[PDB]
Amino acid sequence: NLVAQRFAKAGQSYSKHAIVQKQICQNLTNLLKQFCPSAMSRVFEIGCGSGNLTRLLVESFQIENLVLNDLYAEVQHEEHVKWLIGDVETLEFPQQLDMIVSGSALQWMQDLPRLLQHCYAALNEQGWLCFSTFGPKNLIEIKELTGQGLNYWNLENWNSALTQAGFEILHLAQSETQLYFDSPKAVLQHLKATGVTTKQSLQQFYQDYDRFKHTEGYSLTYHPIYCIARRMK
Amino acid sequence: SLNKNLVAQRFAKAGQSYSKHAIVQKQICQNLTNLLKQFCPSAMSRVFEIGCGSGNLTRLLVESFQIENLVLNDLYAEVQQHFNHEEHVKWLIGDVETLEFPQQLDMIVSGSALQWMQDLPRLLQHCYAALNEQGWLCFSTFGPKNLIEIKELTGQGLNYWNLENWNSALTQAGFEILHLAQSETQLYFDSPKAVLQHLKATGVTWTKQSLQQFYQDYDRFKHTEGYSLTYHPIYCIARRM
Amino acid sequence: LNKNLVAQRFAKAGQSYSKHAIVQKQICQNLTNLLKQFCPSAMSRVFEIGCGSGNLTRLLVESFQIENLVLNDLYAEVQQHFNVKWLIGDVETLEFPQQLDMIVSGSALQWMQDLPRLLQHCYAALNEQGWLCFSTFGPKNLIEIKELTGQGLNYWNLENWNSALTQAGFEILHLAQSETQLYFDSPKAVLQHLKATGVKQSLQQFYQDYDRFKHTEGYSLTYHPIYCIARRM
Amino acid sequence: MSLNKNLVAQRFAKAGQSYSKHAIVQKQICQNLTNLLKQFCPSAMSRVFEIGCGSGNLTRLLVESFQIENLVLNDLYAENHEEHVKWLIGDVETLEFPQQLDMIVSGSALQWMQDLPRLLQHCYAALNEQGWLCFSTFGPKNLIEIKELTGQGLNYWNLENWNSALTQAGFEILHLAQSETQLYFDSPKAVLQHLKATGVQSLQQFYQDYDRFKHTEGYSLTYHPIYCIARRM
Ligand SMILES: C[S@@+](CC[C@H](N)C(=O)[O-])C[C@H]1O[C@@H](n2cnc3c(N)ncnc32)[C@H](O)[C@@H]1O
Ligand SMILES: C[S@@+](CC[C@H](N)C(=O)[O-])C[C@H]1O[C@@H](n2cnc3c(N)ncnc32)[C@H](O)[C@@H]1O
Ligand SMILES: C[S@@+](CC[C@H](N)C(=O)[O-])C[C@H]1O[C@@H](n2cnc3c(N)ncnc32)[C@H](O)[C@@H]1O
Ligand SMILES: C[S@@+](CC[C@H](N)C(=O)[O-])C[C@H]1O[C@@H](n2cnc3c(N)ncnc32)[C@H](O)[C@@H]1O
C-alpha cells in the first residue's frame, strides 16, 4: 500500500504573519495523522511551550499517558498528563514510549547525537520519533545584520544523525518561506509580537535591510525542517 | 494588497516520504481544504462545487464549513448515488460549460476537475458573473508535467495550463489571486505493473503484446527507489475583484 | 384594481364523446388556451417541469416566442423525444434557473412530495409579476382504481391550492377544476386504456368489482384535472 | 399491431374562478366553439354554411383551421374576397339553403330565430349524410339580471328543448353542454358600459335595483351559452 516518493512545492501566498509558528505545528500534525495510528498509549513532548502542538495532539490522537517537557510550565484527564520540567538534556526520559514529538525546540539543543541516544533507548521497537526544527537559513536576515542566531543542522546532517543513531526515516522535508514586510520596522514588530526577540544601531539596522528589499517588501526567512522517523527495524 | 496584518509570502518545499499510492486524490482534496481553512470564513450561505464526483472534497467541505445552500455539479446523473439526499443540497447535472451557473454565490470550489474543461477563459467569465462581490474562487487542478510518464509511452494525456497562464487568465477575468501554488510528486513503484494497477485502482483507466513492451519502455523512468509516476497538482485561492 | 379585467365565476357541464387515448394531450390543450388568455406572446425565459414526451412543450413553442427554454424531467431518457437547455433530475432536488418569465408544468406536480416549499423556489426563481401556470389533478382522479386496488395518490383539492399559493406569495388569476367520467364498454377496456396511456383471479375479481361503477352508457373512469394561472406579487 | 381510435361516451363538469377582459366575451365563445369543431370535424371540408356571421370573428377562426372549398356567409348585413366566398343576405328563415353541405355552423345567432323547428327541417335537407350541424347559442339564464330589472329579454331554449328538437328533426348529438358565467363589475354603470361596448331619471333607481345582485366581488351579469355538435342521419 505504501510507496516511496520525492516532492517539490512552490507558490506565492498571503500570511497573517502573526500565525507563522502555529501553522508549523499544524503542518507537523498533518504528517502525524498520515503515518501514525489514531490510538497511542504513551507519548513524550519536548519543548511544549504554550501548548499549540499539545492541543493539536490530543484532539487528533487518543493517548493514555502524556509527558510534557519544557523549561517552564506555561501551557495554561489530568493524572494522565505529567510534567517533566528543566533542560531536557539534563533529564532522564520516560521509558517504553510509543512516540516522542517535538516542535520548534530541537534547534536549542547543544548535543543532538547524545540526545538521540536517549530517544532510542526510551522508545519501543518501531517507536515513532517525529519533530519539527529549523534549517540554516532560519531568520538569516537577523543573523547577518546583528551577528546573532543559532548554528542549524541541514537535512543531510539530520539524515546521517538519525541513521547513525539507529533510526529509520519515513519522512524528511524542508521549506524556505520568505515573508515580505512593508518596512524593516514591521519586521522587528513581528519578532516581538511572536516572541522571538543605541538609537544609532536601530536606524543603521534599517539602512542595511535594503540588501533584503525585494519588489514585494523586505524579506524575513523561516526555514522549518520536518521529519518522521521510526526506531530500529 | 493595501490591507494590514497580512503579509506577502514566497515558499518552496522539498523532501522524501512514503505515501499510500491509492490515497493521492484524497491527499489533494485534503491539501485544498487546508487552504480553505486559512483564507475563507467558517460560514458561507451559498457554495457551488464543480465536478463533485465521488465526493471526497464534498465530505471535507461540509465538516469544516457551515453552508446554508450547497449546489453540486457533475457530468453523470448517477453521481447522486454516492450521496444521500439532504434538503440544503441542490443538483446541477451535466457539462458545466453548457449550464447556467447558480446565482449569488459566496464561493465556487472544484477539486481536480477543471483540467477537463475545453474553454477555460469562458468559464472564468461565468464564475465572475455568479460570485458576489469579493466572492471566493478556490480550485485544485493539474499542471503540465501531470502523468508525463503515461503521456510519453502511450501518446495520450491532456493539455494543462501552468501557473502564469492561470495567473494571466484570472487577472483579466476580474479575479485577484490570494494563493497560487504547485507541487511535483514522483511516486516510485516496484514495477511498471504496479503503475498500471495503481492507475486502474484509483479509477484513472491491447494486452500481453503491447503490455510487455510498455513494461520495457518504462525502464527509462526507473530510479533506484523504483519506477516513477508524476503528479502535478495546482492550487489556487482567488477572490472576485 | 385593473380597469379592464373583471372578477368571474363559471360552471359548465355536458355530455360528449372522446377518443379515450388523447386525454393527456387534451389536458395540455386546455392549459395552453389558458396560457393564451393571460400571458404575453413573448417571454425570454421559460422553465417547464416534467416535460415528458413533450406534449405541452410543442404547444408552448408553437404559440409563444421564447429565447431561453429550460426543460426538466426525472429521466434523461426523454431527450430522445426532442431535437433548449436541459435540467435532468428530481425538480425538488434541482437548482432552479433564475430570473424567469414563466414556470410551466403539465400533469406533473401531483408527484411532488413537498409542494409548499417547491413553491418557495417558484417564488424566488421568478421575476416580479412572473407567471406560474400548471395543471395537476384533484382528489377524485382515477378514484375507481383507488377504490378497487387501494393504490393511487393523495391529491390536493382547490382549497388546498388556494391556501398554499397565497401563503407562498402568489396571486391567482385563474383557478378551476373539471371532473370527467369516460364510459367504457367493459372493465377490460378500462385496463386496456390505462396501459395504452402509460399509467388470474385477481383479474376476474377486478372485472366483478367494477360492476359497482356501471352506468347507463358504460363503465366509469374519472379524471379530475385542476387548472391554475398564478402570478408572483 | 393496431392503432387506437375508439370514441367513448363522456360526461363532464367544470367550475372555477377567473379574471377576464369584459370586452372579450363573444370572441371567447367563438374560440370555445372552434375548439369543439377541431375535436370532432375533419380538417378538410368542401362546402360550409354559416348563419349569422356578423363581424366575422368566427369566420376568421373557421378558415384559419379548416380547409374549405366553398364558403357561404349569411347575415342580415355584410361586414380576402375570393371567388369561392358567397354572400346570402337577409332573414335566414326566409331564404332557401345552399345544398349538399358538409357543415352548417352558427355562433351566437340562433337565439333570434322565430321558428327553430322549421329551420331544423331546412338544415336537414341541405346537409349531406352524416353532415355536421354545430352551433353556439344561449340558455334561459342569459342576461337574467337585465331581464328582471328591465322586464325585457328573449325567450331561450334550455338543454332539454334542444335535445328533443334535434332528435326530432333527425339529428344525432355528439356533444351537448352549457355554461353559466357570472361577471362581477364594480358598479352597475360599468355593466351598462359593457352592454354598450359589446354591441348590445330612472337610471339612478336601475342602479338602486341592481343592489339585489351585489356579491362581495361586485355586481353580477350572467352569461349562459350553449354548445352543441350534431351530425345528420
Ligand atoms: C519555539 S517554542 C515551541 C512552542 C510550540 N508550542 C511548539 O511546540 O512548537 C520552543 C520551546 O522549547 C523550549 N526549550 C528550549 N530548550 C529546551 C531544553 N533544553 N529543554 C526543555 N525545553 C527547551 C523553550 O522553553 C521553548 O518554549
Ligand atoms: C478526478 S474526478 C474528481 C472527484 C472528486 N471530487 C475528487 O476530486 O476527489 C473529476 C470529475 O470531474 C467531472 N467532470 C469532467 N468533466 C466535466 C464537465 N465537463 N462538467 C462537469 N463535470 C465534469 C467528472 O465527472 C469527474 O467525476
Ligand atoms: C404525466 S407526465 C407529463 C407528460 C407531458 N409531456 C406533459 O408535460 O404534459 C409527468 C412527467 O413528470 C415527470 N416527473 C415526475 N416526478 C418528477 C419529479 N419529482 N421531478 C421532475 N420530473 C418529474 C415524469 O418523468 C413524467 O414524464
Ligand atoms: C350577435 S351576432 C354574433 C356574431 C359573431 N361575430 C359570431 O358570429 O360569432 C349574431 C348575428 O346574427 C344575425 N342574425 C340575427 N337574426 C338573423 C336572421 N334571422 N337571419 C340572418 N342573420 C341573422 C345578426 O345580424 C348578428 O350579426
Closest CA to C10 of D215, D184, D16: D16
For residue B99, give the ligand nearest its CA.
2
Phi-psi label, residue C16: left if phi above 0, alpha if psi -120 to 50, beta otherwise: beta
Chains B and A physically touch (3 or more Cβ atom pairs below 8 Å)? yes
Separation of alpha carbons C68 and C45, rounded Å:
5
Residue pair A163/A106 in contact (Cβ under 8 Å)? The answer is no
Distance CA B214, CA B152 (A): 11
> Does C touch B (3+ CB pairs < 8 Å)?
yes
Contacts of B185 (CB under 8 A, 6+ apart): A5, A6, A7, B19, B24, B230, B231, B232, B233
Strand locations in chain B, DSSP E? 7-20, 43-50, 66-74, 89-93, 105-111, 131-142, 175-189, 222-223, 226-231, 233-240
Q: Which residue of chain C is at minimal alpha-carbon distance from B69?
A: C95
Protein residue with its CA nearest to atom 24 in ligand 2:
B51
Residue C2 is assigned to a structural domain of this protein:
no
| Cβ–Cβ below 8 Å for B18 and A11 | no
- Cβ neighbours for D125, distance < 8 A, ≥ 6 positions apart: D97, D99
Tell me the three state secondary structure of residue D147. helix
Residue B190 domain flag: yes
Taking the CA atoms of D25, D27, D31 and D32 in sequence, report the sign of the dihedral they define.
positive
D136-151 residues labelled b (16+ CB within 10 A) or e (exposed): bbbbbbbbbbbbebee
Write down which chains contact chain A via at least 3 CB pairs under 8 A.
B
Give B142→chain A minimum CA distance, Å: 13
Q: Is residue B31 part of a domain?
A: yes
Q: Give contacts of B93 with chain C, Cβ < 8 Å.
A: 88-89
CB atoms within 10 A of CB B58: 21
CA distance C186 to D84: 48
Calpha distance A109→A90 (Å, rounded)? 11
A151 is an annotated ligand-binding site residue: no
A123: containing domain: 20-231
> Does C96 fall in a domain?
yes
Q: Is D133 in the pocket of ligand 4 (CB under 6 A)?
A: no
Closest approach of B90 to chain C, Cα-based (Å) = 5
Tell the residue number behind the cell numbers 349562459, with chain if given: D224
Contact C73, C51 (CB under 8 A): yes
Q: Looking at beta carbons, which residues of chain D come within 8 Å of C15?
A: 9-11, 173, 175-177
Classify strands A167-181 and B105-111 as parallel, antiparallel or unpaired.
Answer: unpaired
Entry field: residues in chain C: 233
Is B190 assigned to a binding site? no
Q: Is D63 helix (H, G, I), strand (E, B) or coil?
A: helix
Q: What is the C-alpha to C-alpha distance for residues C165 and B17, in angstroms, rounded to an integer?
A: 62
Alpha-carbon span D201 to D179, nearest angstrom = 35
Q: D139 CB contacts (<8 Å, ≥6 apart)?
A: D156, D157, D158, D159, D178, D224, D225, D226
Q: Among A98, A15, A103, which Cα is nearest to A51's? A: A103
* Per-residue DSSP letter, C184: B
DSSP 8-class letter at C96: P
Residues of C in contact with B99 (CB under 8 A): 85
State whether residue A110 is helix, strand or coil: coil
Q: Is D35 in Cβ contact with C8 (below 8 Å)? A: no
Residue A89, SS3?
A: helix
Q: How many helices (H) and strands (E) does chain A have?
A: 7, 9
Q: How far is CA D57 from CA D46, D79, D229, in A?
A: 21, 11, 19
Q: What is the DSSP letter of B145?
A: T
Written as nine digits, the cell of B156 is 495520450
CATH code: domain of residue B106: 3.40.50.150
Q: Is residue B9 part of a domain?
A: no
Write out the three cell numbers for A42: 504513551
CB D89 within 8 A of CB D76: yes
Helix axes D116-126, D159-169, angle to 10 degrees: 40
Alpha carbon distance B220, B227 (integer Å) = 9
- CA distances A187 to A2, A81, A134, A137, A141, Å, are 43, 37, 19, 16, 10
Is residue A139 left, alpha or beta, with left meaning phi > 0 and alpha meaning psi from -120 to 50? left
Report the number of distinct structural domains present in chain D.
1
Residue C168 lies in a domain: yes
CA distance B112 to B101: 19
Cell of C43: 417571454
As annotated, the binding site of D for S-adenosyl-L-methionine includes 30, 57, 75, 91-92, 108
- Cross-chain Cβ contact A176/B5 below 8 Å: no
Report CB contact under 8 Å: B7, A176. no
Does D97 fall in a domain? yes
What is the rounded distance in angstroms from the CA atom of residue B197 to the CA atom of residue B201?
Answer: 6
The C-alpha atoms of residue B62 and residue B71 are separated, in whole angstroms, by 12
- C100-106 and C222-223 strand pairing: unpaired
List the resolution, Å. Answer: 2.5
Distance (Å, whole) CA D69 – CA B34: 79
CA A127/CA A97 separation, integer angstroms: 7
